[PDB]
Design a protein around this ligand. Structure first.
Ligand code: NAG
Ligand code: NAG
Lengths: 188, 182, 11
């Protein structure tokens, strides 16, 4: 079915800084990917973003009860909803699972691939580092970057090109759920 | 750590499919959506619905307004349609693979629009629907979409798996392959 | 507690 499609999107956005001390509410309206009109609480009224949005900006801005509702959204909507879910969103902290293992596909000569798999953590901010018998490894380090699993957990895979011999490699993970670096050592 | 947090109430309506969506998004993860057909709030994690509540009726009214607004935006644009943007597909597991230890294949479908996609899991070329699940379309800051499909499975060197993705923006159906060694 | 909805405005 190759019928032409037409998509409308609306994003009501609440941006928070330092908890609920600073809040920005945005009321954004889209035709396909094109944002055409926007209410920014820092501006105080609707403003067209493209030519397609001139009618809406004028029409909604001429309704005082409408602007007065959107101008209180930072309190009645953003700050309220932040408090509703704060305990299981802002304060959600799940430990990373750190596993170290040689890659099941060893693709290069002389060097082998060592994998530090970090799984199931939340929130997404994480720092993964490789050490070789006490020396930080910045060469031969490959990482997937942060991967969102879509279920409120994240994972990342950080691979090291090792010189396989006897030597001790440490994966060190730092994450907001931890009060100390998490280290896993691999001796070949 | 993270000084900024964003809660997004994201909505869309798509013609002529008459498909709508309403969901809450925190820092890129879904808190809940409203099932259009069932008029029910569906929490992404069931625990969320034990701590918070939401009246689905208001969300459905929003969707109807978005439908009305859409028909006006469509005429206003002289019936300009959406450009198909094909997805990029990645297949991975939720944890490191181990023989006969339950795992989950994740099919990550990213950066696409319109929000309509046909996904099918294949085990050895045969479709598999046992225990599959999926998310709604998640919003992106380029205002494309993202989607996850999941397949619980028992890893073995015997089996190979594919995520078959069909989208209007693609030329051939997209097949992302996964084996034990991937 | 209850989540609040923000209204999508009809044009
Ligand atoms: C953050 O908010 C707290 C509590 O309102 C306040 O005491 C503090 O000064 C704020 N800090 C910054 C950097 O805004
Ligand atoms: C999706 O594709 C399958 C074949 O893999 C087909 O049986 C099914 O009808 C399709 N559904 C839609 C909505 O395209």
């Amino acid at each position: 079915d190759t019928r032409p499609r037409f998509l409308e999107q609306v994003k009501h956005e609440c941006h928070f800084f330092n908890g609920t001390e600073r809040v920005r509410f945005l009321d954004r309206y889209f035709y396909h990917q094109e944002e055409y009109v926007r209410f920014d609480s820092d501006v105080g009224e609707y403003r067209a973003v493209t030519e397609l949005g001139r009618p809406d900006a004028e029409y909604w801005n001429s309704q005082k009860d409408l602007l007065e509702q959107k101008r209180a959204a930072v309190d009645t909507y953003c700050r309220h909803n932040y408090g509703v879910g704060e305990s299981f969103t802002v304060q959600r902290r799940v430990y990373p699972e750190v596993t170290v293992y040689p890659a099941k596909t060893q693709p290069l000569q002389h060097h082998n691939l060592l994998v530090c798999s970090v799984n199931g953590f939340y929130p997404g901010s994480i720092e993964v580092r490789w050490f070789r018998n006490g020396q930080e490894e910045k060469t031969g380090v490959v990482s997937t970057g942060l991967i969102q699993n879509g279920d409120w957990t994240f994972q990342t895979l950080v691979m090291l090109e090792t010189v396989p011999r006897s030597e001790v490699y440490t994966c060190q993970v730092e994450h907001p759920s931890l009060t100390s670096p998490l280290t896993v050592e691999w001796r070949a | 750590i993270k000084e900024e947090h964003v809660i997004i109430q994201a909505e869309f309506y798509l013609n002529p499919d008459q498909s709508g969506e309403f969901m809450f998004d925190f820092d890129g993860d879904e808190i809940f959506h409203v099932d259009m057909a069932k008029k029910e709030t569906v929490w992404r994690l069931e625990e969320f619905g034990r701590f918070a509540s939401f009246e689905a009726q208001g969300a459905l009214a929003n969707i109807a307004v978005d439908k009305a607004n859409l028909e006006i935006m469509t005429k206003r644009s002289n019936y300009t349609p959406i450009t198909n943007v094909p997805p990029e597909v990645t297949v991975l597991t939720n944890s490191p693979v181990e023989l006969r230890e339950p795992n989950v294949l994740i099919c990550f479908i990213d950066k696409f629009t319109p929000p309509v996609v046909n996904v099918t899991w294949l085990r050895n070329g045969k479709p598999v629907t046992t225990g599959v699940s999926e998310t709604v379309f998640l919003p992106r800051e380029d205002h494309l979409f993202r989607k996850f499909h999941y397949l619980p499975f028992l890893p073995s060197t015997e089996d190979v798996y594919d995520c078959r993705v069909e989208h209007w923006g693609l030329d051939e159906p997209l097949l992302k392959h996964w084996e034990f060694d991937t | 507690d209850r989540y609040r909805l923000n209204y999508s405005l009809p044009t």
